[PDB]
Design a protein around this ligand. Structure first.
Ligand SMILES: [Cl-]
Ligand SMILES: [Cl-]
Ligand SMILES: [Cl-]
Ligand SMILES: [Mg+2]
Ligand SMILES: [Mg+2]
Ligand SMILES: [Mg+2]
Ligand SMILES: [Mg+2]
Ligand SMILES: [Mg+2]
Ligand SMILES: [Mg+2]
Ligand SMILES: [Mg+2]
Ligand SMILES: [Mg+2]
Ligand SMILES: [Mg+2]
Ligand SMILES: [Mg+2]
Ligand SMILES: [Mg+2]
Ligand SMILES: [Mg+2]
Ligand SMILES: [Mg+2]
Ligand SMILES: [Mg+2]
Ligand SMILES: [Mg+2]
Ligand SMILES: [Mg+2]
Ligand SMILES: [Mg+2]
Ligand SMILES: [Mg+2]
Ligand SMILES: [Mg+2]
Ligand SMILES: [Mg+2]
Ligand SMILES: [Mg+2]
Ligand SMILES: [Mg+2]
Ligand SMILES: [Mg+2]
Ligand SMILES: [Mg+2]
Ligand SMILES: [Mg+2]
Ligand SMILES: [Mg+2]
Ligand SMILES: [Mg+2]
Lengths: 106, 61, 156, 197, 127
RNA sequence: UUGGCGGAAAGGCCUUGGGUGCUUGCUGGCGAAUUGCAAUGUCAUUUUGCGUGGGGAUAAAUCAUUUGUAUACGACUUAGA
RNA sequence: GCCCUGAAAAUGGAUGGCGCUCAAGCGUGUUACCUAUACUCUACCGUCAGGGUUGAUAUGAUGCCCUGACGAGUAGGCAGGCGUGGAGGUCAGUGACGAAGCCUAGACCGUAAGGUCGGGUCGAACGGCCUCUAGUGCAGAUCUUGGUGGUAGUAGCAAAUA
RNA sequence: GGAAUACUGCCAGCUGGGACUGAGGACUGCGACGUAAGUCAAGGAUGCUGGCAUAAUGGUUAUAUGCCGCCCGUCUUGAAA
RNA sequence: GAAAUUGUUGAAAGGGAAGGGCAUUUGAUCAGACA
């Protein structure tokens, strides 16, 4: 069909931070359709990928990926905390990420 | 934070070895170190400590 | 001498490992995984396909069939954490799956025996699929997330 | 959800809307605001006029071209409130402001698109009934905005065209509704009802 | 081909550079401790360079180990090369910088016979 | 392809006729494997350059000279087949 | 009680800013949530304390190992180390088949002082270890001597008729 | 008059999802389940499997982005002054 | 035949200084094990 999506759209908001100090080792993620910490429990442990493009082709591809995972909820509005193998770059604040349905408990 | 009651990292203040570099004196220390560890006799403990003393702390008899 | 030799050298002998207390025990799958349950594949070459769960193998893998005649998915192994268990089920009584095991999928074109036993297993499944309307069409299609669909609220 | 969200600014409180829009821009959503001249501010007209004149007297003493710039248009007034809620001196702040457009009236590119509202910022849902409020269109005119009449004339022309479009759309909807109702009461309709559709 | 070891961990790979060594040419990068009364570096204000301290010390198990798992031992001739004959799984020979080209050929041949790893075998090679 | 409408940044909207591809509205028959138990598994739009061939059109500005309605120097304002 | 009058200062202006009016204000009550080098658990470094272990046939009893606790710091004290000129001993050490020196967003070791290697340049001496010794470590002193910048193709090179 | 429920507390009641960690390295101890032999979640992780074997991971360096960072030395109760 | 300082060539960045710390993207470059 016209749709082939098997992931849930997400946004990279910022790093974990206080008023004046940030922590790049943890990123805050907003998941579309999630507005409650109870609903965000469903996505705990799910894999996250950030997909971007580069001019140089390395392994027979010009598309690169950074992998992560959902660890815990954040606040009262459905935001979650995510950690990545390599920390996401700060220029991606406001960029789209993909939340996959695996590992699954259904 | 800990509200310490005593000074931290304080040395015992007692000599645990001779200050001398005498090779034969160190052999006597090694001999009585072994005896004090495996004889539980108060005499050996006293002798071992006495071998660490300085000159003014070992007046002639 | 450019460098003074050390007085002491470390031992060249490797030490034995301490006895471990970690006994392997069988995996228990989640209750939704029952033979005959229709599964949705989340990753791999056949992502989005709807297959039929047949047997649980000894390497903690799930044996599935498309059937190959319906959607082109052959007899394969899948990981339990990479599938979705749906609420629809097809009866498996009348399907022989005893011959398929871990060794049958040894890595070491398509072999003749794989073609033959694919037809044998699919024939029983296809007869059961024809019992209910639209099931054959349902297994031919692919699963996809649409706009506004929330997986934490959808029931499969 | 939409790649571009167009907000009709009529009946929205300036500060409440600006706070909502600023957060959306920082989260990566492109926003277009139309009809900035119909924005509302809580408090009577005279009180808000005095506030702008307090802003007017602030300027660099030795060179007025260096001091704060006082923009009179309604779209620029809303832009000032929005820029104050964004770290606009950073590259991240600059990028967010580039995803925003503000217009007086509804320009031709967006007059045939769908407009939405922000309930958190709507005056009729926030202010206590009886409280005084001011309209941004008349406030801008009193402080030197020269294009109130031009926008009003263009808006009147647009509404005539939009009203004619709605008449055709309404008649088409009635025809579609009749066909669906007639197509009901059938076996296919009965099955859809059992499944909720 | 060395002894098995736990993964080597470096607590602080970044070099400790002297404060303001990037501001004045006369201030070298060799580490020096600031002793000024008002120094922000000495007082450890936020956003300033880190200072060496004993907490950064590496694990004693993997201390002095090269990434190949061996310890480096400088070698000047065949005689001191042969001191590593029984220790090929813990030490690796490195040829001194001032050994002539012809003598390096002799050392490399003996090391190959004894199975001793050489860390700089391409030095002064007339290839 | 026919016609109408749209100037606020219109660059879009509607309509007529025919040709052509598909149709899951319904019923059939073939094909898929081996990417080996997951690895974005590559399906979008930005700019620009080099070579093919199908059309289109065959200029100016500056320096130098000159002018004084101009002018510290630049600049400005005039003239010259 | 809240609000208002009483309530006048000089560059333009600050509940931190925007802005906010059944508040995003004031009084009060109930919950959820955010995050310090603090608290809890774990690993690693060091320090201190209490202990185990000489029995040859394998090298450090100042060795190896077990257990617990602790770690801010100017003036100042003490301890363990790094580097430099020269001296005794030793490695029957390195070297014109290239010693020393110098250059090197090249590699490795050490918490650090530093040490090691490769490449280039170069041409005659030099290093490791155990000890001895001192005219032994620089960013400053309107420090000493020498060298070199920005200023800058800048100020200017216009008295005495041509 | 007989119950229910709320509130507070207790269980050496059961069970699902997520994150971080794997220090040690023959045996020795305390226990559990067993008529027995033995087994075990009992003084610290093992089992199975895939891809790649090179700039892929990683290091160095330049740059970009988020947040943070006032000029050292000196006298001083107090120095970016 | 070092440094300050300078020319040429090559690379990179630059909206009222420059330089620094933590983290990662991109470019360039590089060692280690293939038992
Ligand atoms: Cl002129
Ligand atoms: Cl060191
Ligand atoms: Cl930055
Ligand atoms: Mg004006
Ligand atoms: Mg280092
Ligand atoms: Mg002070
Ligand atoms: Mg220090
Ligand atoms: Mg309150
Ligand atoms: Mg803490
Ligand atoms: Mg402490
Ligand atoms: Mg201290
Ligand atoms: Mg040389
Ligand atoms: Mg250099
Ligand atoms: Mg000579
Ligand atoms: Mg002196
Ligand atoms: Mg000096
Ligand atoms: Mg000084
Ligand atoms: Mg001076
Ligand atoms: Mg002059
Ligand atoms: Mg001049
Ligand atoms: Mg003059
Ligand atoms: Mg004259
Ligand atoms: Mg990398
Ligand atoms: Mg930065
Ligand atoms: Mg920034
Ligand atoms: Mg700051
Ligand atoms: Mg004073
Ligand atoms: Mg000061
Ligand atoms: Mg010369
Ligand atoms: Mg130079």
């Amino acid at each position: 069909a016209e749709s082939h999506r098997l992931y849930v759209k997400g946004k990279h908001l910022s790093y974990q931070r206080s008023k004046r100090v940030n922590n790049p080792n943890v990123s805050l993620i907003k998941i579309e359709g999630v507005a409650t910490p109870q609903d965000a429990q469903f996505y705990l442990g799910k894999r996250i990928a950030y997909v971007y493009r580069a001019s140089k082709e390395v392994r027979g591809s010009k598309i690169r990926v950074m992998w992560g995972k959902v660890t815990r909820t954040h606040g009262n509005s459905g935001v979650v905390r995510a950690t990545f193998r390599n920390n996401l770059p700060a220029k991606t604040f406001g960029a789209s990420v993909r939340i996959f349905l695996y590992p699954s408990n259904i | 934070g800990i509200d310490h009651t005593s000074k931290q990292h304080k040395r015992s203040g007692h000599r645990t070895a001779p200050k001398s570099d005498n090779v034969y004196l160190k052999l006597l220390v090694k001999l009585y170190t072994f005896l004090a560890r495996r004889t539980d006799a108060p005499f050996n403990k006293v002798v071992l400590k006495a071998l660490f003393l300085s000159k003014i702390n070992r007046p002639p008899v | 001498s450019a460098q003074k030799a050390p007085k002491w050298y470390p031992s060249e002998d490797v030490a034995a490992l301490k006895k471990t207390r970690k006994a392997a025990r069988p995996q228990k799958l989640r209750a939704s995984l029952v033979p005959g349950t229709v599964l949705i594949l989340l990753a791999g070459r056949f992502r989005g396909k709807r297959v039929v769960y047949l047997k649980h193998l000894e390497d903690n893998t799930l044996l599935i069939s498309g059937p190959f005649k319906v959607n082109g998915v052959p007899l394969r192994r899948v990981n339990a954490r990479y599938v979705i268990a749906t609420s629809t089920k097809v009866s498996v009584e009348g399907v022989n799956v005893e011959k398929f095991n871990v060794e049958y999928f040894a890595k070491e074109e398509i072999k003749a025996e794989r073609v033959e036993d694919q037809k044998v297993v699919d024939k029983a499944l296809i007869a059961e699929i024809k019992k209910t309307p639209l099931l054959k069409q349902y297994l031919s299609a692919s699963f996809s997330l649409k706009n506004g669909d929330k997986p934490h609220m959808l029931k499969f | 959800v939409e790649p571009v969200v167009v907000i009709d600014g009529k009946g929205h409180l300036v500060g409440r809307l600006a706070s909502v829009v600023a957060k959306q821009l920082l989260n990566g959503q492109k926003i277009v605001v139309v009809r900035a001249e119909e924005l509302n501010i809580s408090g009577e007209f005279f009180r808000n006029k005095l506030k702008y004149h307090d802003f007017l007297r602030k300027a660099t003493a030795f060179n007025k071209t260096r001091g704060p710039f006082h923009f009179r248009a309604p779209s620029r007034i809303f832009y000032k409130a929005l820029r104050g809620m964004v770290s606009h001196k950073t590259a991240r702040g600059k990028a967010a402001l580039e995803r925003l457009k503000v217009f007086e009236g509804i320009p031709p590119p967006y007059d045939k698109k769908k407009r939405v509202v922000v309930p958190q910022a709507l005056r009729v849902l926030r202010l206590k009934p009886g409280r005084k409020y001011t309209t941004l269109g008349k406030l801008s005119t009193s402080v030197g905005w020269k294009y109130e009449d031009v926008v009003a004339k263009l808006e009147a022309k647009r509404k005539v065209s939009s009203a004619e479009y709605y008449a055709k759309k309404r008649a088409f909807t009635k025809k579609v509704a009749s066909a669906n109702a007639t197509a009901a009461e059938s076996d296919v309709a009965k099955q859809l009802a059992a499944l909720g559709y | 081909a060395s002894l098995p070891h736990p993964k080597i961990v470096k607590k602080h790979t970044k070099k400790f550079k002297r404060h303001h060594s990037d501001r004045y040419h006369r201030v070298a990068e060799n580490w020096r401790k600031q002793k000024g009364i008002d120094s922000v570096v000495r007082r450890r204000f936020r956003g300033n360079i880190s200072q060496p301290k004993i907490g950064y010390g590496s694990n004693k198990k993997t201390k002095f180990l090269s990434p190949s798992g061996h310890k480096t031992f400088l070698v000047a001739n065949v005689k001191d090369l042969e001191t590593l004959t029984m220790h090929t799984k813990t030490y690796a020979a490195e040829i001194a910088h001032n050994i002539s080209a012809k003598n390096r050929v002799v050392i490399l041949a003996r090391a190959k016979a004894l199975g001793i790893k050489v860390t700089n075998p391409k030095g002064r090679l007339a290839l």
